[PDB]
């Protein structure tokens, strides 16, 4: 006639609401991937597969007096569908803490929730920026056709601008230009954030004006690398099946462990808008 | 019925009653520590910390006609606020005995519950009589300031009791006398029963009269040790957040596991009423 | 920590399990069952045998011959046979929104394995646990099934088996179970005139001649189909139950509880 | 529905019977599920317009 | 209340399993459960009864 048992959801309504709010907000704080990209809307739990379009196209538009160009852009052989993985963590909550938060001291502590959701989002950003060979996925710094360009010039007072200038030139060489967005590793970003370039102000302001979609920081990237991409759709996408949400796994010895879910898959529909070291 | 699985609780009211009665009875049978220790009232499930209060204190107290002598009240040495551990064991039921015991064998077979409760009580007695150093807890034979007395002169009836006599003398010198008690290891409890020639009266009866709160035997204590205590309050206590209760752990492999729980903490409010080897 | 499926999908799963069972069970077409006793029971009474008491006193008034009873009263424990499979929560959601088959191939595989294990149990007791096997029973009345691959083959062995049953004073409508190798190769259509050899064996047996691929290469048995000779104590028919969600993937287990009690091990012939 | 699950591979795990169910009867897919897609097959029906016209007010 | 629960830290568990179905990575929890005692901080001052009476009659 009390808490003991293997019953269904232990948490009351408001406690569930607080858990969901915490995971959502810490996700919003900790996600850098979902700002440079843009998401195909939430398809739902059921959708396990999404189309994965073929590759580049060097076919541009044309203008004639009477439309006769026929403007072909056709996928060739297959469509090679792919599947949407899942990412998760744990919520080992004590039963005595829940019991105390009912008739006693009652700031129900969900610190483990924020920690686990932060770890989950970190793993997800690792997925976007680096595919895993076990599932055979593609990562931005390990894709095919990255259009590499050396850097070899930082640690100088102003030897960082020309690297992104060259990257933009190479990216426009493939006839693929637009609002660029840059993501950099932590130490590289801080080093870029240094004193005046001797020709004005902090370099990041000029780089941000050149990119036109911001320069972002990612701890999850390797030590000395970074990327610049074309933020528009028709080039890259983030297929989402369901956003971060906490669900009840089961009953432990007597505790309650939870698990945070989100199903994401990047689609590089055009591996021409990627540039790296 | 039994196929839906993961029901909130399998058993009925009568079977819960029998399980609880069995664990209570076996606990009361096999507990020795709870027979010389006045228990704190059941605080509740939520409480996890209790005021582990005192280390010392003395105020001889005086009397005079008017009622004015200004003797400092015994308040506390310093608050410490230890945390209440949990002691548990677990057993299993075969999901058919629960079904047979509603048609064929009306009283449900619960021998595994007694088997688990005996081990739980053994572990609890070990907790009282010994710390574990993984939680900084204190034990009867591990407490600092134990008033050790060299007592090895046995195998000769011309002695043995004199060890307890010296223990009482040492307890008296520290200004602490009352209804004494003795808990002895089996290797010496049996040795007391010796009927060596020139018997007269066995030493056990003399020791029982000298103690006046019973000489007890416990296997959990080590092979070559024994203690003398003062049974009253304000020297020892037993914080009881909750007694032996059987709770459910979901249904694994369609069987039914259960766990016997209690939350106990020994607090010695006066680590002077202790004597050891 | 919940209960996954609703009524329609539960009914579909149960129907699939029942269908695969009734298709694959060969024992249930040769032995009649003691009524479903419920999941509660775990022990049943057992055989009576070699009750040698002619009882043919045949005197006006009556004599005091010995009554027939269990030779040695004892009990046996009804086993449990089970197979476990798994389902994915995303699969259930997809079958709920996009498509609507709700693939249950795993359930069919589990039911098939359970039925094969059950039939092996009936035709061979578990030596480790220790039971009675149709081809390993004591008092089996062995008859040499050899010298086949001949024009007059299985008939010469079935007639000998029937005369050995009748000599033991145990007769009636017999039934035959043969290994698939023989039950196929036995179609030596030419006995003499026009009738299948298996057809004339079936006429001789009068309660079918079935095959069960679980038997060994060159073995077969003939029994007396009635009750009070052989039995099949059932505790619960093959049914699927839920083992509780773990890691959001729902497991499941198909259960059956059977035990054969050969009351009169005089209705046996083998190789 | 363009994609369907494609389950892993064999399993040599058989069922078992015990007095009390404790076999745990595991049969678990290991690493992935490697979904696949459903192709299409087709041919042609070149029907004359005059034949359809004839089958209206004439030979039909 | 006089005691509160306490930190969880160095929960090194990537949780980035990222597999269809799910793996069995380690859950995050308090590294070592323990408690702390909430202190009390206080400051004491004094007031004179004549001051209160004066503030009640002469000035306010």
UniProtKB/Swiss-Prot annotation, chains A, B:
Disruption phenotype: Does not form fruiting bodies. Decreased survival when grown under oxidative stress (0.5 mM H2O2). GO terms for cellular component: encapsulin nanocompartment. It is found in: Encapsulin nanocompartment. Its main location: other. Shows substantial structural similarity to gp5 of the HK97 viral capsid, and while the sequence homology is weak, it suggests this protein may have evolved from a viral capsid protein. Has 3 domains; a discontinuous peripheral domain (P), an elongated loop (E) and the discontinuous axial domain (A). Shell component of a type 1, iron-storage encapsulin nanocompartment. Encapsulin nanocompartments are 32 nm in diameter with an iron- and phosphorus-rich core (4Fe:1P) about 24 nm in diameter. Upon expression in E.coli most particles are 32 nm, 20% are 18 nm. The core is filled with an average of 14 dense granules, 5-6 nm in diameter that are not evenly distributed. Each nanocompartment is estimated to hold 30,000-35,000 Fe atoms. The minor proteins EncB, EncC and EncD probably lie against the interior face of the nanocompartment. This is Type 1 encapsulin shell protein EncA. It comes from Myxococcus xanthus (strain DK1622). The gene is encA.
């Amino acid at each position: 006639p009390d808490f003991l048992g293997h019953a269904e959801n232990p948490l009351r309504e408001e406690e569930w609401a607080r858990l969901n709010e915490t995971v959502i907000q810490v996700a919003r704080r900790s996600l850098v991937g979902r700002r440079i990209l843009d998401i195909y809307g939430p398809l739902g739990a059921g959708v396990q597969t999404v189309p994965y379009d073929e590759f580049q196209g060097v076919s541009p538009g044309a203008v004639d007096i009477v439309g006769e160009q026929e403007t072909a852009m056709v996928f060739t052989d297959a469509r090679k569908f792919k599947t949407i993985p899942i990412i998760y963590k744990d919520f080992l909550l004590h039963w005595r803490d829940i019991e105390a938060a009912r008739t006693h001291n009652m700031p129900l502590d969900v610190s483990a929730a924020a920690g686990a959701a932060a770890l989950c989002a970190q793993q997800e950003d690792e997925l976007i920026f680096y595919g895993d060979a076990r599932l055979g996925y593609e990562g931005l710094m390990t894709a095919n056709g990255r259009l590499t360009v050396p850097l070899g010039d930082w640690t100088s007072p102003g030897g960082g601008f020309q690297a992104i200038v060259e990257a933009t030139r190479k990216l426009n060489e493939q006839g693929h230009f637009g609002p660029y967005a840059v993501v950099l590793s932590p130490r590289l970003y801080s080093q870029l954030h240094r004193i005046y370039e001797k020709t004005g102000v902090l370099e990041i302001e000029t780089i941000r004006q050149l990119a036109s979609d911001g320069v972002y920081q990612s701890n999850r990237l390797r030590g000395e690398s970074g990327v610049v991409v074309s933020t528009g759709r028709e080039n890259m996408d983030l297929a989402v099946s369901m956003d971060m949400v906490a669900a009840y796994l089961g009953a432990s010895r007597m505790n309650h462990p939870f698990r945070v879910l989100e199903a994401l898959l990047l689609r590089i529909k055009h591996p021409d808008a990627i540039c790296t070291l």
